[PDB]
DNA sequence: TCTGCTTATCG
DNA sequence: CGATAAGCAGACGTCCTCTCGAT
RNA sequence: AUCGAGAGGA
């Protein structure tokens, strides 16, 4: 009648028990708090699951409550100094022009609520309009490569760590932004 | 007693202790629209003198440090204008004796 | 004491803390330390001179302390010391050292700001050492100048001193720093200067904050044993004393030669590091571990920490000798205060008994019996330190018992033990019991002593504790005995009542069909232990001598007991046998239930405890049980499953009830689906639906339950257990036979865990009852699968709520006890504490112990003025309103006597003064109140024991009654002082009781109703006076602890509605909560007008905050450059209406819905003027009329304006205000009932409109006109502390605590809650029960140790050099002394 | 068996002072120590059987007093002494003046 | 049968209703620090062997342990071994002062590191007494 | 540092704590077989002997009731009233 | 889950 | 440069009976 | 015997 499933170790039949953890590599949107600057956060926890624990927790937050009109959106990065604006991230990737960015975030050009919600990020990234400069913000002229390293070998590793794919990370970040804004609209 | 109609600056409350005696009492107007002592939960506080206070301090074997204290910012301490350590009697009504004397010193 | 000396046994009185001067520890220490090796290369008996050997003692337990030379037991351990060269910081003081440098410029060596500065007299003159520091350091936090306003002193700058890790450096204006510099500037700092910082010239000087040489603890702080003899043994502390020393050697290596840039500080940093972590492991920075792995370190602090540390766990409580523990079982044939003690346990515990002529015979016999025969003894002690071991000794039978010898005899029958049940919530859980040695290994209990312990007999184990001296068994017998604790100070009621089988069968026994024959009655009679032996005459004789249960039961009730009680339908003939009448200890009518014997307030236990005494009542417990148990034994009682089966017609008739509920829910659903749900005020169109449908289903459930309950015959066993209140409630019947009802998670319907459905066997967006957690079936009917799952969700929430609220409750009691502890009535009957600060001047405001108080009425308060007139009026000068000569010997002898009517009108005058005075306090009209002497139970105790003739006249004159009453009040005493203050306080203390006294001892009353005589009246006077003098509290009574418990035990039973109710409310009330989850206002109407719903709606419409944002459908910006012609096709008429007799061309249009403009009556003109008033002349604003179809507001500003318009709109949606108060959020009009005096005198209840709000800004809410600003109530007591003074905050706080407690149908007597509220209130403003709320006081450092922060308090007391008078409990308990508490309040001598 | 502070509360509410000292000294750890009337700490060397008592660092050899405290309290005071805090124990509440 | 308690039929119990077997399996092994010293299973001497358990060794054989079938009660030494130090010193293993029964059996077998190691199983019948939880 | 035997304010009735301390001290004296001051009607339990001497008030002791200001007042067990 | 150091905003 | 008002890091939620591993 | 974890009972 014995069922097995245990390990005899120095006499005692020790048992491994099941452990519970939140699933990796999935898009979650949690509102931070009531009295906080951040009103919304898009988290994704990322590990390769073939390699052991390239733990990367990406937070794409949003600033300002319902009353504040400065709805600037930033995002965090592994090994980075602090949370940088999203348009600078897109210019770091293959997408320079404002509005081609929008095609990665908003999937119906007749959704003026979500479109209008996005305007202040463009002004946060008005002061950057080329790729070479987008990596340059990230921090002595090697920083760009450093940035690209963070963009390839650290940031969003649950896609890949090859330099060839940056459109995938771009569309996926746009999907994260879509989820975040779609929650912020109360939909 | 200075009744101001809206509010004062920090430089206006910087001269309250200016004149050594005769100290000035700065009161708002929205506070004095309604009498707080007319609310049911507020009893009839009663000032007393240094002689009545000394009678309290000897007929109870008490040092000043032992009285249930009140503060100069207390609304009914303002209402009666309590100075440093001016003691009050408080006639409280309760379910047990129906009358109880409380004594309060002014911190 | 294990020897004698030419030294006296002194006691510890005051304890002075401080710091170790290095100059001192160098001398106090017996020996140095030279090197770190704990053991020896030779590894011999000595360990080496280098560490913990030389004249410090050793481990072979024989004669090993070099210094003491008195062995291993009498060696305290004579401290050693290191003499390290480089001084470093003491981690406990790090913040303080930072602050001390802030007040002295480095080159000065003296304070920053002198007495010349007048911005110090408000602060330096505090003279309260460590309170001053908090302000005077902030004064000195940022001054960089150190030199007429310029006197002698240096002028150099000093850095804005910052710290990182374990050191501190900072920029002067850019700089570095060192440790020796800090020590240097403190030896140079003057004597008078640090004394204002909170220091002492000899006990703690800041030069000793820095440690030049640390002391080493003796070996008794370093144990070492091992399983293997041939190996090492070491305590954890030694490892790192040796680590510190190893660091002390690195520095000598770097001393012998040069030290490069790293060797400069890398060695000193780590040396101070190891000293730092010697004292502490957790600094929220570097975490570190010992060589042996497992994050292990000394962290001496953590020795003393909360959970299981030294102070909170080894001094507040100890593993103790003479202790026991086992499972429990209830034995009816045990008496109440008896305890069943197993034979093996009584064969193990010993009481040392001294030899004296009366016990020497039995003591000799006990020695003869020895340890394994039960009435024996384990040891015998001679007149020396020589023990005799009876279990194996040669002379075990050859004993010569000299006098004064000690025999450690076995615990004997009928001795005092202390019985405990964990958790010890209140002091009825630690009670002295009388031993009875029984077999079978289980502690035996009386049945009716379950309740004060809260123990079932399902395994709940209990403890037993045994005294060791005569004084302590006396203290148990006379203070802690169970019969004493029968009636309890908390709830002013008894805690022990007849329970569960006795009680279940008592109702069966006292029915009107319950008849008993002779053969049974005889056994019942002999069963009662203390009875005369006289057979009662059978109530019925006629064909067969039979007996009633009331008859043979009244044999258990002692004569002289009288009891009245009335219920619904209780005439003087009770046809449903309702209520209860008892006279002379005999039952006259009624059915006996929980109301009469179930530990009730006005119950036979509370009656017999006071009248007869405690012993008679404790014996009464057993005397009732032994009869009723028996009658149940031979009559029997069961409970089947047919007890839940109701009629086929009934069971069907509840299902149609659920069916009509389903019709109702479906109809309201189809209504809401058509947008026709006109959601009422302040509630969502969804919240309306949820609340309404939940109401529907709960009403259907209650209807089905009470439709089943009506169908339970008088045979149904569940009904008969509910009937006595044995163990049963209504809802039990409802869920088990009708319908369990509706489950709920987080105070709401079942959740939408799946997207738009509740379970994947349902469609989407199903808001139906079955889909939302309603169970149409009952436990008997059988729950379906989905229903079982939803029930499981609800039950799991119930389980976690229990497991969490119990933990919170225990924390509540911990804080409460540690706060109120040592609030003890002093000898002047004045509630006080250690310091002596008065909390209450009169305990409970009357000086009366809560045990003797009883709920009695005052007939004066209620009733018409005409009914009051019929009483108490004595118009001798009238033919009709005089005492008829039928009632008095001199009835017509004093008719019209003037000199008597003087006193009689004086009596009526003070009666009327009394009525108005009492009506002025108790404005509800409630007369039933706790009063210290039960007068009616005296009157029946005089109408009985004096055999009054109810037709003859009395023998007292009016003079007698009136002056005797007036002289009785002169001798009812609480305080005995000799001067006016204390006499006024005594008058005030007995005021209310005198009101009751005259209410019941009036001339008309005494002579018409009571029909008293002179002899019995004088008896009644003496009796009332004596009972009163008995009811007064005793000095030494610790009511602080008792009050904390009297709040804590009820809080345990508070398991669970628009407000924060119950335990969360209590947690925020006690923590005084700056922000609360349910703030509210209770708003009362005009005194003249309180029933006009028009003005109620008006006030509601003038208080509810309204933002323009709350009505704006759309805010849109247009380009419209030429105003006379707009671009919008439905706007040109509005612009044409500006004809009646320059801009920016950037329009701002706003569109508002018409619904919210009508939900709160609103016009376009009002909103338009509010916008115009906000922007006074910086915005042109027009609008469309109310009569239109689309409400629109248009605005224009009066280069670079593409962006500077939107921010105006943003401030125009947030910082606007319409008609409303700032913080208010909603309001509801509700009609309250209100008892009020009708003109003719009677108290009739009137209805009045009251407004309940969300949020509070009372400071200007009360000023709002049209309301009663003499009544308006804010549940937030914290705002009421700020608005209406403090004496109103005390009252609001007590009201909140009350409503918390009494929301569970509970009752705690006013004393304890009022004491808690006071103790928080007396310290200036509101004081919370937290680590920083009350423990922030200056009570005593050792007293503060017992609560959360321990080494923080100890360090601050050592720095500030506090002084502990050791006049509180925890102080003495730390040093194990008889605290001046209870028995210790007073000294005894010749 | 543990005598928890939850039980000390109940043994305070009843008023059993001597029972509490019993169950916190005699029925548990208890200890006799020698205290210097000048120092105030457990410094005095107690070599009994000859009435030899002295306090190093304070020269006291006549003004010494014995006391009764829990050994846990002696341990606490010792750990404080090793932590540089001096909980001076004085025999009378009256200061000299 | 008050407060969630019950009564059990003693006639039924005496027939064996709700009767239990309870085996406590004690264990030990020697050579705690091998290649320097070595402990030895034996019934020790009372002379120059120091920490002699105050209980009786007289139920122990010369190999230092009991045989199956012996009744044991209280502080009976069940397994005896000594630890030498510079004679032998006691390392015996008594019973639990709370229980009593009969030696069910004994198992003698060396460990992975070759060393004498013993498992002694003691057995007791437990009858439903008056307070046992059900 | 004193008080008079007149001008006393505390309750003349014996508190239960005074009663318990008195009975315990007396029962201790009797357990150590010190001289007893009444006759025993067959009472060997020393606490009950203390209670007998209490009902007779032949226990020569005094209660020094302490006042929070350091004052006190004495009450001989011969003087106090016992209604508990 | 509340507090007591900082830090920069404001007059 | 004397107030004010945001930060951003800080802490604790009775007994008791086994067994195990590894210092 | 010390430490630390886990498992249950109240
Ligand atoms: Mg139970
Ligand atoms: Zn010694
Ligand atoms: Zn200077
Ligand atoms: Zn000294």
Chain centroid to Cα C1280, Å, comes to: 22
Instruction: Report the alpha-carbon distance of residue C761 to residue C767 in Å, rounded.
Output: 14
C78 labelled ligand-binding: yes
Q: What is the dihedral of CA C1362, C1366, C1372, C1374, to 10 degrees?
A: 0
Tell which residue, C967, C961, C959, has the closest CA to residue C1011.
C961
Q: Which two tokens stand for residue C385?
A: 């330190």
- Choose among D16, D32, D74: nearest Cβ to C480: D16
Instruction: Report the alpha-carbon distance of residue D16 to residue C1390 in Å, rounded.
Output: 23
Q: How far is CA C318 from CA C88, C404, C420, D27, in A?
A: 37, 31, 15, 9
C1' of H10 to CA of C206 (Å): 26
Quick check: C915 contacting B, CB < 8 Å? no
DSSP string for residues in E24-74: EEEEEE--TTTTT---EES---SSS--S--SSB-TT--TTSB--TT-EEES
Tell which residue, C887, C918, C902, C883, has the closest CA to residue C998.
C918
| Residue C1248 DSSP code | E
Chain centroid to Cα A105, Å, comes to: 13
- Kind of pairing between the strands at C350-354 and C406-410: antiparallel
Instruction: Report the alpha-carbon distance of residue F57 to residue F81 in Å, rounded.
Output: 10
CB C507 within 8 A of CB C580: no
E28 labelled ligand-binding: no
| Residue contact F17–D15, C-beta within 8 A | yes
Q: How far does the centroid of ligand 2 lie from the alpha carbon of residue C217, in Å?
A: 13
The parent domain of residue E101 ranges over 20-127
Bond into C423 cis (ω within 30): yes
- Kind of pairing between the strands at B100-106 and B69-70: parallel
Instruction: Report the alpha-carbon distance of residue C87 to residue C211 in Å, rounded.
Output: 5
Q: How far is CA C474 from CA C178, C615, D95, in A?
A: 64, 17, 37
Other Cβ atoms closer than 10 A to C784: 13
- Residues in chain D, total: 97
| Residue C91 DSSP code | G
Structure-token match 């805690």, residue found = C495
C1' of G4 to CA of C306 (Å): 23
Q: How far apart are the first and last CA of chain B?
A: 21
CB C960 within 8 A of CB C1015: no
Q: Which two tokens stand for residue A163?
A: 């330099």
- Choose among C979, C988, C1270: nearest Cβ to B100: C988
C100 three-class SS: helix
Q: What is the dihedral of CA C640, C646, C647, C652, to 10 degrees?
A: -140
Which bases of chain G are under 7 A from a protein CB atom? Answer: 2-6
Q: Which two tokens stand for residue C1279?
A: 């705002």
Chain centroid to Cα C1028, Å, comes to: 29
Tell which residue, C89, C195, C189, has the closest CA to residue C133.
C195
Strand partners, C464: C324, C419
CB C158 within 8 A of CB C106: yes
Residues of E in contact with C327 (CB under 8 A): 131, 133
Rounded to 5°, the CA angle C110-C116-C117 comes to: 90
- Kind of pairing between the strands at B2-3 and B26-27: parallel
Q: How far apart are the first and last CA of chain C?
A: 25
CB C546 under 7 Å to nucleic chain G: no
HEC-encoded secondary structure of C481-510: ECCCCCEECHHHEECCCCCCCHHHHHHHHC
- Choose among F7, F17, F46: nearest Cβ to C470: F46
Tell which residue, A143, A145, A162, has the closest CA to residue A81.
A143
Q: Point out the ligand nearest to the CA of residue C158.
A: 3
Please state the φ and ψ torsions of residue A122, each to the nearest 5 degrees: -65, -40
* Model resolution, angstroms: 3.5
Instruction: Report the alpha-carbon distance of residue C81 to residue C1388 in Å, rounded.
Output: 45
Strand partners, A14: A7
CB C482 within 8 A of CB C338: no
Any chains having at least 3 CB pairs less than 8 A from chain F are B, C, D
Q: How far is CA C539 from CA C12, C66, C197, in A?
A: 70, 90, 87
Any chains having at least 3 CB pairs less than 8 A from chain A are C
- Residues in chain B, total: 107
Report H helices in C1328-1378: 1341-1345, 1351-1360, 1369-1374
Residues F75-84 as b or e (16 or more Cβ within 10 Å = b) = bebeebeeee
The nearest alpha carbon in chain D to C323 belongs to: D1
- Please give the nucleotide, over all strands, whose C1' is closest to the CA of residue C458: I10
DSSP E strands in C196-261: the ranges are 215-216
Rounded to 5°, the CA angle C1151-C1152-C1153 comes to: 130
DSSP string for residues in C1109-1164: GGGEEEEE--B---TTS-SSTTTHHHHHTT------SB-EEEEE-SSHHHHTT--H
Instruction: Report the alpha-carbon distance of residue C585 to residue C587 in Å, rounded.
Output: 7
Instruction: Report the alpha-carbon distance of residue E51 to residue E54 in Å, rounded.
Output: 9
Please state the φ and ψ torsions of residue C468, each to the nearest 5 degrees: -135, -5
Quick check: F24 contacting D, CB < 8 Å? yes
Instruction: Report the alpha-carbon distance of residue A119 to residue A112 in Å, rounded.
Output: 11
**Max CA pair span of chain E:** 64
Q: How far is CA C1235 from CA C862, C919, C1015, C1232, E98, in A?
A: 11, 12, 42, 10, 68
Residues A8-32 as b or e (16 or more Cβ within 10 Å = b) = eeeeeeeeeeeeeeeebeeeebeee
Structure-token match 């957690």, residue found = C773
| Distant-in-sequence contacts of C385-393, Cβ < 8 A, 24+ apart | C385/C2
Q: How far does the centroid of ligand 1 lie from the alpha carbon of residue C328, in Å?
A: 10
Residue C104 to chain D, least CA–CA distance (Å): 24
CB C1296 within 8 A of CB C1073: no
| Residue C312 DSSP code | I
Q: Between helices C1351-1360 and C129-139, what is the axis angle to 10°?
A: 90
Residues of C in contact with B79 (CB under 8 A): 1285
DSSP E strands in C1271-1350: the ranges are 1273-1274
Quick check: B84 contacting F, CB < 8 Å? no
What is the edge-to-edge ordering of all strands in the sheet holding E81-84?
A: E40-41, E81-84, E88-90
Other Cβ atoms closer than 10 A to C1326: 18
CB C655 within 8 A of CB C580: no
Please state the φ and ψ torsions of residue A12, each to the nearest 5 degrees: -65, 140
Q: How far apart are the first and last CA of chain E?
A: 13
Give the 3-state secondary structure percentages of chain D, helix then strand then coil, rounded to 5.
30, 25, 45
Quick check: D15 contacting F, CB < 8 Å? yes
C1' of I6 to CA of E50 (Å): 37
Q: How far is CA C106 from CA C135, C208, C1025, F49, in A?
A: 21, 17, 74, 75
CB C501 within 8 A of CB C447: yes
CATH code, domain carrying E104: 2.40.50.150
Residues of C in contact with E133 (CB under 8 A): 327, 458-459
Residues of B in contact with F67 (CB under 8 A): 61
Interface test with C, best of E2, E7, E55, E133 (most C CBs within 10 A): E2
| Residue contact F17–C1382, C-beta within 8 A | yes
- Choose among E4, E85, E86: nearest Cβ to C458: E4
CB C587 within 8 A of CB C550: yes
Rounded to 5°, the CA angle C1112-C1117-C1121 comes to: 135
C1' of I6 to CA of A4 (Å): 21
Domains with residue ranges and CATH for chain D: 1-85 (3.90.1800.10)
Residues of D in contact with F17 (CB under 8 A): 15
CB C548 within 8 A of CB C590: no
C1' of I4 to CA of C292 (Å): 12
Tell which residue, C432, C414, C444, has the closest CA to residue C326.
C444
Q: How far is CA C511 from CA C500, C515, C631, C1317, in A?
A: 17, 9, 13, 47
Please state the φ and ψ torsions of residue F73, each to the nearest 5 degrees: -155, 145
Q: Does A have 3 or more CB contacts under 8 Å with B?
A: no
Q: How far apart are the first and last CA of chain D?
A: 47
The parent domain of residue A108 ranges over 25-187
C1227 three-class SS: strand
Instruction: Report the alpha-carbon distance of residue C502 to residue C327 in Å, rounded.
Output: 23
Please report the sign of the dihedral spanned by the C-alpha atoms of residue C1251, residue C1252, residue C1255, residue C1257. Answer: positive
E4 is catalytic: yes
| Residue C642 DSSP code | G
Please state the φ and ψ torsions of residue C473, each to the nearest 5 degrees: -70, -30
D36 labelled ligand-binding: yes
Burial of C173 from C-beta contacts in 10 A (0-12 / 13-18 / 19+): exposed
CB A57 within 8 A of CB A42: no
Q: How far is CA C280 from CA A57, C276, C1357, D9, in A?
A: 33, 6, 18, 31
Q: How far apart are the first and last CA of chain A?
A: 54
C718 three-class SS: helix
Other Cβ atoms closer than 10 A to C1143: 13
CATH code, domain carrying C575: 1.10.274.100
Q: Which residues of chain C (1061-1100) touch nucleic strand G at CB < 7 A? A: 1071, 1073-1075
| Residue C843 DSSP code | G
CATH code, domain carrying C1209: 3.30.1360.140
The parent domain of residue C535 ranges over 501-634
Q: Which two tokens stand for residue B86?
A: 């001016």
């Amino acid at each position: 009648f014995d069922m097995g499933g245990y390990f005899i170790i120095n006499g005692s039949e020790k048992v491994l028990i099941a452990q519970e953890r939140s699933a990796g590599n999935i898009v979650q949107v949690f509102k931070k708090a009531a009295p906080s600057p951040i009103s919304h956060v898009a988290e994704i926890r990322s590990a390769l699951e073939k390699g052991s624990r390239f733990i990367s927790t990406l937070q794409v937050k949003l600033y300002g409550r319902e009353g504040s009109s400065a709805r600037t959106i930033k995002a965090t990065l592994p090994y980075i100094k602090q949370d940088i604006p999203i348009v600078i991230i897109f210019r770091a990737l293959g997408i320079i022009p404002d509005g081609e960015i929008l095609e990665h975030i908003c999937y119906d050009v007749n959704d003026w609520q979500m479109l209008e919600m996005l305007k202040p990020c463009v002004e946060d990234g008005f002061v950057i309009q080329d790729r070479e400069t987008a990596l340059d913000f990230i921090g002595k002229e090697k920083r760009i490569q450093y940035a690209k390293d963070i963009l390839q070998k650290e940031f969003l590793p649950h896609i890949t760590q090859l330099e060839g794919f940056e459109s995938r990370k771009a569309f996926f970040l746009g999907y994260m932004i879509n989820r975040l804004l779609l929650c912020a609209l109360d939909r | 007693i200075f009744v101001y109609q809206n509010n004062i600056t920090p430089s206006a409350m910087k001269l309250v202790p200016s004149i050594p005696p005769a100290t000035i009492e700065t009161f708002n107007e929205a506070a004095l629209v309604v009498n707080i002592t007319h609310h049911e939960l507020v009893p009839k506080h009663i000032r007393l003198s240094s002689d009545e206070k000394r009678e309290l301090l000897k007929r109870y074997r008490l040092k000043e440090s032992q009285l249930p204290r009140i503060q100069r910012a207390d609304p009914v301490a303002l209402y009666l204008g309590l100075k440093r350590g001016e003691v009050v009697k408080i006639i409280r009504k309760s379910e047990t004796s129906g009358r109880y004397a409380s004594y309060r010193i002014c911190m | 004491g294990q020897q004698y000396s030419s030294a006296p046994l002194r006691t510890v009185k005051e304890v002075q803390f401080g710091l170790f001067s290095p100059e001192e520890v160098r001398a106090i220490s017996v020996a140095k330390i030279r090197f770190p090796e704990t053991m020896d290369e030779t590894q011999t008996r000595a360990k080496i001179g280098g560490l913990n050997d030389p004249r410090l003692g050793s481990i072979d337990r024989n004669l090993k302390c070099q210094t003491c030379q008195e062995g291993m037991n009498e060696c305290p351990g004579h401290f050693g010391h290191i003499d390290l060269a480089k001084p470093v910081f003491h981690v406990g003081f790090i913040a303080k050292i930072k602050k001390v440098c802030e007040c002295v410029c480095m080159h000065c060596g003296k304070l920053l700001l002198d007495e010349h500065n007048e911005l110090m007299r408000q602060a330096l003159a505090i003279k309260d050492s460590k309170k001053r520091f908090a302000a005077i350091w902030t004064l000195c936090k940022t001054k960089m100048v150190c030199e007429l306003v310029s006197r002698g002193g240096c002028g150099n700058t000093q850095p804005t001193i910052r710290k990182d890790g374990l050191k501190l450096v900072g920029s002067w204006k850019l700089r570095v720093l060192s440790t020796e510099e800090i020590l240097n500037i403190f030896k140079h700092i003057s004597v008078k200067d640090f004394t204002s910082l909170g220091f002492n010239e000899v006990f703690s000087r800041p030069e000793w904050m820095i440690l030049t040489c640390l002391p080493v603890p003796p070996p008794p702080v370093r144990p070492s044993i091992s399983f293997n003899e041939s190996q090492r043994g070491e305590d954890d502390l030694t490892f790192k004393l040796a680590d510190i020393l190893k660091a002390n050697i690195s520095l000598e290596t770097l001393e012998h030669n040069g030290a490069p840039h790293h060797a400069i500080e890398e060695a000193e940093s780590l040396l101070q590091f190891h000293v730092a972590t010697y004292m502490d492991n957790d600094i929220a920075g570097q975490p570190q571990a010992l060589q042996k792995s497992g994050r292990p370190v000394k962290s001496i602090r953590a020795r003393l920490k909360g959970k299981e540390g030294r102070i909170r766990g080894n001094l507040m409580g100890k593993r103790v000798d003479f202790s026991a523990r086992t499972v429990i079982s209830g034995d009816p044939n045990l008496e109440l205060d008896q305890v069943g003690v197993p034979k093996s346990i009584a064969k193990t515990l010993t009481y040392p008994e001294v030899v004296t002529p009366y016990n020497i015979d039995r003591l000799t016999q006990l020695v003869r019996n020895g340890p394994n025969e039960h009435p024996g003894a384990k040891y015998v002690i001679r007149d020396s330190g020589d023990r005799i071991d009876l279990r194996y000794s040669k002379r075990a039978g050859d004993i010569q018992l000299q006098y004064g010898w000690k025999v450690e005899r076995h615990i004997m029958d009928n001795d005092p033990v202390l019985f405990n049940r964990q958790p010890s919530l209140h002091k009825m859980s630690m009670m002295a019991h009388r031993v009875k040695v029984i077999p079978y290994s289980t502690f035996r209990l009386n049945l009716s002593v379950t309740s004060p312990y809260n123990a079932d007999f399902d395994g709940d184990e209990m403890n037993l504790h045994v005294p060791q001296s005569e004084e302590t068994r006396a203290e148990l017998s006379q203070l802690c005995a169970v019969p004493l604790q029968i009636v309890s100070p908390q709830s002013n009621k008894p805690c022990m009542g007849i329970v569960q089988d006795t009680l279940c069968g008592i109702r069966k026994l006292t029915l009107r069909d319950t008849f008993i024959e002779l053969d049974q009655v005889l056994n019942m009679l002999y069963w009662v232990p203390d009875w005369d032996g006289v057979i009662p005459t059978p109530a019925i004789i006629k064909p067969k001598p039979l007996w009633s249960g009331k008859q043979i039961l009244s044999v258990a009730i002692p004569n002289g007991i009288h009891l009245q009680r009335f219920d619904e339908g209780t005439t003087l003939l009770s046809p449903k046998d309702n209520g209860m009448l008892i006279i002379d200890g005999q039952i006259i009518f009624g059915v006996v239930e929980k109301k009469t014997v179930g530990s009730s307030n006005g119950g036979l236990i509370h009656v017999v405890t006071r009248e007869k005494g405690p012993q008679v009542c404790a014996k009464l417990f057993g005397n009732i049980q032994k009869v009723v148990n028996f009658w149940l034994l031979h009559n029997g009682f069961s409970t089947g499953i047919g007890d839940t089966i109701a009629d086929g017609p009934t069971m069907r008739e509840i299902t149609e009830t659920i069916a009509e509920a389903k019709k109702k829910v479906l109809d309201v659903t189809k209504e809401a689906q058509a947008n026709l749900l006109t959601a009422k005020h302040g509630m969502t169109l969804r919240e309306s639906f949820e609340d309404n449908v939940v109401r529907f289903l709960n009403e259907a459930r209650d209807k089905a339950g009470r439709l089943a309950e009506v169908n339970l015959k008088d045979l149904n066993n569940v009904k008969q257990m509910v009937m006595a209140g044995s163990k049963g409630s209504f809802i039990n019947i409802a869920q088990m036979s009708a319908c369990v009802g509706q489950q709920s998670v987080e105070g709401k319907r079942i959740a939408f865990g799946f997207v738009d459905r509740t379970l994947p066997h349902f469609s989407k967006d199903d808001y139906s009852p079955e889909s939302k957690g309603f169970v149409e079936n009952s436990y008997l009917r059988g729950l379906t699968p989905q229903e079982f799952f939803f029930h499981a969700m609800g039950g799991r929430e119930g389980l976690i709520d229990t497991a969490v609220k119990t933990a919170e409750t225990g924390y509540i009691q911990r804080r409460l006890v540690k706060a109120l502890e040592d609030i003890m009535v002093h000898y002047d009957n004045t509630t006080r504490n250690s310091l002596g600060n008065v909390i209450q001047f009169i305990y409970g405001e009357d000086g009366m112990d809560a045990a003797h108080i009883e709920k009695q009425s005052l007939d004066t308060i209620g009733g018409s003025d005409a009914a009051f007139e019929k009483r108490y009026r004595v118009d001798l000068l009238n033919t009709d309103h005089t005492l008829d000569p039928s009632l008095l010997e001199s009835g017509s002898e004093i008719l019209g006597d003037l000199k008597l009517q003087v006193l009689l009108d004086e009596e009526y005058k003070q009666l009327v003064k009394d009525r108005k005075f009492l009506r002025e306090v108790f404005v509800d009209g409630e007369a039933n109140w706790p009063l210290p002497v039960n007068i009616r139970r005296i009157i029946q105790n005089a109408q009985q024991t004096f055999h009054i003739d109810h037709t003859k006249p009395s023998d007292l004159t009016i003079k007698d009654i009136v002056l005797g009453v007036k002289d009785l009040q002169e001798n009812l005493l609480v305080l005995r002082g000799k001067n006016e203050i204390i006499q006024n306080a005594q008058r005030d203390a007995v005021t209310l009781f005198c009101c009751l006294l005259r209410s019941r001892l009036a001339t008309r009353r005494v002579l018409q109703e009571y029909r008293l005589t002179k002899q019995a009246f004088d008896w009644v006077l003496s009796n009332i006076e004596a009972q009163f003098l008995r009811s007064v509290v005793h000095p030494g009574e610790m009511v602080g602890v008792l009050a904390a418990q009297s709040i804590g035990e009820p809080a345990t039973q508070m398991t669970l509605k628009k407000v924060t109710s119950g335990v969360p409310r209590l947690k925020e009330i006690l923590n005084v909560a700056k922000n609360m989850k349910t703030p509210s206002l209770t708003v009362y109407l005009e005194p003249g007008h309180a029933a006009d719903q028009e003005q109620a709606k008006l006030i509601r419409s003038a208080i509810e905050h309204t933002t323009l944002k709350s009505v704006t459908i759309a805010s849109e910006i247009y380009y419209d450059p030429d105003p006379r012609s707009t671009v919008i096709p439905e706007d040109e008429e509005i612009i044409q209406l500006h004809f009646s007799l320059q801009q920016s061309p950037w329009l701002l249009r706003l569109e508002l819905d018409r619904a919210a403009m009508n939900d709160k009556d609103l016009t376009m003109g009002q909103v338009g003027e509010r916008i115009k008033q906000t922007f006074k002349n910086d915005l042109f604003v027009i609008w469309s009329e109310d009569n239109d179809e689309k409400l629109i507001i248009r605005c224009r500003v009066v280069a670079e304006e593409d962006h500077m318009l939107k921010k105006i709109e943003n401030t125009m949606l947030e910082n606007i205000t319409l008609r409303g108060v700032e913080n208010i959020e909603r309001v509801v009009m509700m009609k309250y009932d209100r008892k009020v005096p009708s003109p003719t005198g009677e108290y009739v209840k009137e209805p009045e409109w009251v407004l309940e709000t969300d949020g509070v800004n009372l400071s200007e809410v009360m000023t709002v006109p049209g309301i009663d600003p003499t009544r308006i109530y804010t549940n937030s007591f914290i705002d009421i502390m700020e608005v209406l003074g403090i004496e109103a905050g005390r009252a609001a706080l007590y009201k909140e605590v009350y409503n918390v407690i009494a929301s569970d149908g509970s009752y705690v007597n006013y004393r304890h809650m009022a004491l808690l509220v006071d103790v928080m209130t007396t310290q200036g403003g509101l004081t919370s029960v937290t680590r920083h709320g009350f423990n922030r006081s200056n009570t005593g450092a050792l007293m503060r140790c017992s609560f959360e922060e321990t080494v923080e308090i100890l360090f601050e007391a050592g720095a500030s050099a506090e002084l502990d008078d050791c006049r509180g409990v925890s102080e003495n308990v730390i040093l194990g002394q008889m605290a001046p508490i209870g028995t210790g309040a007073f000294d005894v001598m010749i | 068996l543990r005598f928890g502070e939850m039980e000390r509360d109940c043994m305070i509410a009843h008023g059993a002072a001597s029972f509490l000292k019993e169950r916190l000294m005699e029925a548990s750890d208890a200890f006799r120590v020698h205290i210097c009337g000048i120092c105030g700490l457990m410094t005095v060397i107690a070599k009994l059987n000859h009435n030899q008592f002295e306090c190093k660092g304070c020269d006291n050899k006549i003004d010494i007093y014995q006391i009764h405290i829990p050994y846990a309290a002696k341990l606490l005071f010792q750990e404080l002494m090793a932590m540089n805090i001096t909980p001076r124990l004085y025999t009378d509440r009256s200061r000299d003046f | 049968n008050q407060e969630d308690s019950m009564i059990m039929n003693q006639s039924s119990i005496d027939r064996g209703l709700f009767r239990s077997l309870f085996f406590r399996s004690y264990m030990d092994q020697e050579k705690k620090y091998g290649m320097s010293i070595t402990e030895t299973f034996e019934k020790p001497q009372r002379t120059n062997t120091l920490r002699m358990k105050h209980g009786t060794y007289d139920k122990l054989d010369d190999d230092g342990l009991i045989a199956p079938g012996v009744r044991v009660s209280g502080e009976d030494v069940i397994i005896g071994k000594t630890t030498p130090i510079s004679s032998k010193r006691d390392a015996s293993t008594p019973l639990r002062s709370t229980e009593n029964g009969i030696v069910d059996q004994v198992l003698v077998t060396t460990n992975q590191d070759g060393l004498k190691f013993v498992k002694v199983r003691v057995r007791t019948t437990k009858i439903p007494q008056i307070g046992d939880k059900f | 540092k004193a008080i008079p035997k007149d001008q006393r304010a505390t309750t003349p009735y014996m508190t239960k704590y005074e009663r318990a301390r008195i009975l315990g001290t007396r029962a201790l004296q009797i357990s150590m077989n010190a001289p007893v001051f009444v006759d025993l009607e067959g009472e060997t339990d020393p606490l009950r002997i203390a209670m007998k001497e209490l009902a007779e008030k032949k226990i020569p002791l005094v209660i020094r009731r302490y006042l929070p200001d350091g004052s006190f007042e004495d009450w001989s067990v011969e003087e106090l009233i016992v209604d508990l």
